[PDB]
Every structure is written in structure tokens, then in C-alpha cells.
Structure 1
Amino acid sequence: ETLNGGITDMLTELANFEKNVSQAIHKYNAYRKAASVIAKYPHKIKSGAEAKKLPGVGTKIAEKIDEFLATGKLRKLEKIRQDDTSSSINFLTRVSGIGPSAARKFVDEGIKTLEDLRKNEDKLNHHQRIGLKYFGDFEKRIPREEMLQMQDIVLNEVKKVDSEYIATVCGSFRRGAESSGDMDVLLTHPSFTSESTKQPKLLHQVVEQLQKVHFITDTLSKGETKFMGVCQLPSKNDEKEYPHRRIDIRLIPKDQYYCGVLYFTGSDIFNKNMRAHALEKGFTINEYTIRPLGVTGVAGEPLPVDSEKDIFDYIQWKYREPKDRSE
């Protein structure tokens, strides 16, 4: 956690670099399990050889561990860090829509800058266009104060369209968070569940409304169950317009709301921990259900959930307010 920090951090740098600038999923996977194991290791790695004993660590990495242990750096790292091409890819990649694959390509063609990207908006698809368009806004955190106004809006319309709709803003925001990266609304309806052959308009009706009143202002991707746009707070009485925020909305079979809802509220750790718990308690939990475990090794049989509570009760735990779902 801090005993092996540099080593891991270096290893991760290396990893990430393989995967992105180069297409070396292997090396790239190497550096990762290595970085994974050395992390767990309960003592101070004092040399390569020591590390070397570790599963996942071989001659390659050890040698890096030495250089790094020896002199506070690493050449490859010093080289990579400096390297234009490499830096370029790491950056383009910042744009919503541009992955590594495309980042490599662009660069190859000579697009390395945001400006480059402009002059060639043409080479970019829709997504990427928006991403480039709101690059600044997209990189900004969402102040909870604002989250509150947005939630205020989304809920109201959802309702207006159909009062039968159940919407919940999930994420860190749900967990008390001072700021957030983007708004994630979870949604379901009664007439929509596990079996009931869909109802696409269900997602659509609402999306339509949001755009209708100008809350949603762009569409990165809209399908029958997941919508992925951009929204914005009505820039009040001039002088202060609001930044463009990422927003996602997902339809859910009512019969699998809360599990999902649980899930997305996080945190990543409370989850795991919640999940690990259910196991002892004779269960299993996943993004959609909670099935009683059977002794034969495994089992199925989706238990009936009406609220976050039921899930808890099942595993016989203490209802934990989102606020404290931090771990």
C-alpha cells in the first residue's frame, strides 16, 4: 500500500504504456499481474531477486526493479515520458470518443494536438465531435450543488411523462459525494421486467422529454436501454452559463432495479465487501439479482427484491445508508 508504491507505480506506468502506445497486451498483461502481486507482498522489496521469487515476476521486471531500487528512476520510463509520440497518444485519448486505437491512427496521420483535431473535424465521428466540442466541460467535476439542480429536473419530467416511472440518481452523488464526474440515472418501470418483451419507447419517451425542455443537448449514443448524452443547466439570467455535463440513463426491468441500484451506488469496495458477504451468508450477488447458493458447488433461483433493504435482509446485514456505503 506504501511499502511497495514506487515499484507498483512504476510497473503500472510500464503496463499502461504497453497497452497504449504499443499493442502489447501480453507485456501489458505481464506488468499488471506483477504489479498486482508485489502489491500484496507484506514486506519491503529490497532487490530484484527478492521480488523475483514472486509468481508473475521474472527476469524482465526484476531487472527493472533493480534499476529502480538502485537509482530513483528507470531509463525506459525516462525515455517513454519524454517521447513525443507516446505523449501524443496519451493525450488524444483524453477526448471522449477517442480510444487508443484511434489515438494511434490520428497520430500517425499527424494529429497530435487539440487544434489538429479541429482542422480535421471531418476525420472524427459524431461521438468524437462532441467530445472535442466539450473537451473543457467534460474534464470538469460536477459540483454537488449543481447535481441537486439537475436531479431536480430529471425527476420532475420523468414523472410528468409517466408517473409510473421510478428514477434514481446513482453514483458517488448518491453516496454523499461533494462532486461527481457525471450524472448516472437508473430507471425502470412496472410494465418493464425480465420477461415482458421490452418497451423501447419507455427509454425514448423520457429522453424525448429531457431534450424537449432543453436539458439534454446532445446524444452520444441512444439505444433501447442505455442512452448516453450531454446535458446542461439552463444558463439562468445571463453572465453565467453552465458547463456541458455527461449524462447517462438506463432502463431496467423493474424486476432487477435495486440490485442494479445497489451496485451502481458503489462503492467499488462496499460492493465487493457486500458481495463477499452474501457468499458466506449462502448467496451470490451481481448487477441484477441475488441467488441462494446450493451446496453442489453452485446454484440459481433469483430472490425477489422490492428495495435495497430486501437485499440486505437476505444477507442478514445492517441497512447501510448510501452515505456510508463507502466500504
Structure 2
Amino acid sequence: MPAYACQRPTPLTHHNTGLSEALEILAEAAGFEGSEGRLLTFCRAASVLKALPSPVTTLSQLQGLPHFGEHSSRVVQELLEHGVCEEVERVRRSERYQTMKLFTQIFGVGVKTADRWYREGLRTLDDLREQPQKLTQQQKAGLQHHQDLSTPVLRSDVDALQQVVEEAVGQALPGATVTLTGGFRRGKLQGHDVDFLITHPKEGQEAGLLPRVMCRLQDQGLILYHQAFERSFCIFRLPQPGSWKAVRVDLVVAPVSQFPFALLGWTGSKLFQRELRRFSRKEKGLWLNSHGLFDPEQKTFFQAASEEDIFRHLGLEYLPPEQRNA
């Protein structure tokens, strides 16, 4: 078992679901306290279990696995022996965990804002609605639409949204393409938003595209919320039988020269990409982002025509999107 998530296939469904979910609770709780190192270790330990070929049944099977030390092993031991880990259950029922989770789930609210509200004594969404002076326009939209945004986005919703986005993109710039990214490209059947990556086969023609796309979607009445730019974090109006629902949609534009890097980055998972960028820099001395891959010694950028190119330039076996579910 290699130490970095980008070195091993991680399927969407696996054989250690309960164990990984418990470790991810502790990772999430660490993030709510600003403990980014412990968040990473618990996320990585969870991801290792996702990559295993069969269930962990005995504590000895953790021997030699990367990112399992005293603490993560004790969590697993307790789950194996008792079906529950006292620390995990204590986190789950804690007022701090439940409120930070509730607040950070709001679009426009991060850990720092949620924590300040928590310290001020706020605990519920109606507490926030009662004092709208302390809310940004973004947070107001996130709170108004919070119920719909808490409802899973289905693969059926995705096809309908993609046709609508393609219509606007085609008028904004004939020839431009729309690619489904994020968790749905990794094979997820549900999500909390839909991610699209837009480009054009003629380098440079994509400049200034996203404002033109957004204006057209807005004129169709499809935009419930949005803020020169190349990423848009929108709330869309999605038809439903006899009604509609709000759905988060992310639109991103990249020039075709960068498209493989943007596709790789926006396909995720989030942990997979952090691990890939960490691997690139620490193991290969190369600097990776969603625009390119930089050699800081030669001061040169690697040209890539495909995701396969990028895995090759990093010395990694190719993983299709369905095996990037770290």
C-alpha cells in the first residue's frame, strides 16, 4: 500500500465503509477546530481503507498500512470489538460538532464564520435568519436556498442541466464545449452540486466567455444566484414535476492548452488532488495546479494533451476518474 492516495486506485464503493466513515467524522471535527494536520491524517487513513481489496476484520491487518498509528488504530479496534467508537460517538452528539456542521454547510459560510457565530451563542438556522444584518448577500442566498441545497442532486438532474448549459454556451461562443466534471465524472450517482468545465478548440477564443454565458443563463430565468472571471459558483433553477428546485452549479472556463490540467483538478476527489499536488512537489520537484505543471529548475511548463500525459510526466500509473475516489 503506497503512502500517497494518487499512487493507488480508490473506487467509489469499497469494503470498509463503516470504518472509513468513522475516521472521516474525526477528520471533519479536526477541521472545525482548525487542526489541519490531524484532518489530513484522518482523511488519509480513511482513504487507505477505501483502497483495500477486502474488509478489515482484525487489528493485525492494519500493521504496515500508511497513516495508521496509535489513534486511528484504536478507533478501528473499538469499531471491530464493539461496533462503535466512543470518541466518534461523543463527537457526533456534541453541540459543537452538530452546529459547526450545520453552519459550514451553508453556502457562504466557512469554518471561521461558523466558529464566530458559535462563540456568539448562535445554534440554529433560524438564529441566523433572525439577525440578517450579520449576513452577506451570498450567505442570505445560501440560507434562503438551504433546504433545496441539502437535497441530493441526481444523475437525471445532471443531464437536464448540461443541455441547458450547452445551449447558453453555444450562443455565447459557437464551438465551445461543456464537460461534466467533479464527483459525477468519478461515477457518483448523487451529489451536492454539478461541476462543468468549458473550453474552445481554438486557443484564446475562450477569453471573456464566462460573463457571456452567465448573462444568457440569467436572461433565460435560470439563475437564482450568482456573484471578468473564469469560475462561477451559481444557484440554478432546475425544473421538477409541476415545480422546480434550487441546485448548486459550478462553471469553469479554461483555455484548451490548460484543459487537461483543469479537467484533472476539477475531477478530484479533493483529497486525491491535494495528494497529487503534494506528490508532484515533494517526490518529483514539480509544481502542479489546475493550469499547468511547472519545473522550477528549468523554469518550464509541461505541455499536456491529456490526463494520461500528466500521469506519465509525474511517473504515476494512470487512474481513470472512477479510481480517483480518495
TM-score per shorter chain, which class?
A: 0.5 to 0.7
Superimposed CA distance per residue, residues 139-159 of structure 1 (whole angstroms, 9 cap, x where no aligned partner): 222333332332222212222
TM-score, reference length from structure 1: 0.67
SS in 1 for 2:245: coil
Superimposed CA distance per residue, residues 289-323 of structure 1 (whole angstroms, 9 cap, x where no aligned partner): 589x9xxx999553363xx59959x99xxxx9xxx
Tell me the equivalent position of 2:231. Answer: 226
> In the alignment, which of 106, 117, 120 is matched to residue 109 of structure 1?
120
SS in 1 for 2:243: coil
Quick one: higher RCO (CA 8 Å, sep 6+), 1 or 2? Answer: 2
Tell me the equivalent position of 2:243. Answer: 241
> Is 127-136 or 258-267 further displaced after alignment?
258-267
- Computing the radius of gyration over CA atoms, which structure comes out larger, 1 or 2? 1
TM-score, reference length from structure 2: 0.67
> In the alignment, which of 106, 121, 145 is matched to residue 132 of structure 2?
121
Change (3 A) 1:298 1:157: same
Question: Are residues 1:87 and 2:98 paired?
Answer: yes
Post-superposition offset of 1:218: 0.9
Spell out the pairing of 1:122-271 with structure 2 (5 A cutoff).
Answer: 122-173=133-184, 178-189=189-200, 193=204, 199=207, 201-219=208-226, 221=227, 224-233=229-238, 240-261=242-263, 264-265=266-267
* Matching residue's letter, 1:215: L
Superimposed CA distance per residue, residues 50-89 of structure 1 (whole angstroms, 9 cap, x where no aligned partner): 969987634x666666666665544444433332233222
Aligned residues: 293
Provide the aligned C-alpha RMSD in A.
Answer: 4.8
Checking the alignment, whether the CA contact within 8 Å between 1:259 and 1:286 is kept in structure 2 is: yes
Percent identity of equivalent pairs: 22
Q: Distance in 2 between matches of 1:164 and 1:289?
A: 23
Tell me the equivalent position of 2:58. Answer: 44
Change (3 A) 1:303 1:156: same
Q: Distance in 2 between matches of 1:161 and 1:55?
A: 48
Post-superposition offset of 1:132: 0.8
Post-superposition offset of 1:119: 0.7
Checking the alignment, whether the CA contact within 8 Å between 2:239 and 2:245 is kept in structure 1 is: no
Post-superposition offset of 1:160: 1.7
Post-superposition offset of 1:12: 3.9
Superimposed CA distance per residue, residues 113-154 of structure 1 (whole angstroms, 9 cap, x where no aligned partner): 121121122212122211111111112223333323322222
SS in 1 for 2:59: coil
> Is 77-86 or 129-138 further displaced after alignment?
77-86
Q: Runs of 5+ in structure 1 lacking a partner?
A: 277-282
Q: Distance in 2 between matches of 1:179 and 1:203?
A: 26
Change (3 A) 1:251 1:77: closer
Change (3 A) 1:76 1:255: closer
* Matching residue's letter, 2:26: L
Q: Runs of 5+ in structure 2 lacking a partner?
A: 1-13, 280-285
SS in 2 for 1:107: helix
Checking the alignment, whether the CA contact within 8 Å between 1:232 and 1:242 is kept in structure 2 is: yes
Post-superposition offset of 1:208: 1.0
Superimposed CA distance per residue, residues 7-43 of structure 1 (whole angstroms, 9 cap, x where no aligned partner): x6544433432331x3444555565566677888988
Checking the alignment, whether the CA contact within 8 Å between 2:59 and 2:77 is kept in structure 1 is: no
Post-superposition offset of 1:183: 2.5
Tell me the equivalent position of 2:302. Answer: 302
Checking the alignment, whether the CA contact within 8 Å between 2:149 and 2:248 is kept in structure 1 is: yes
Q: Distance in 2 between matches of 1:264 and 1:141?
A: 20
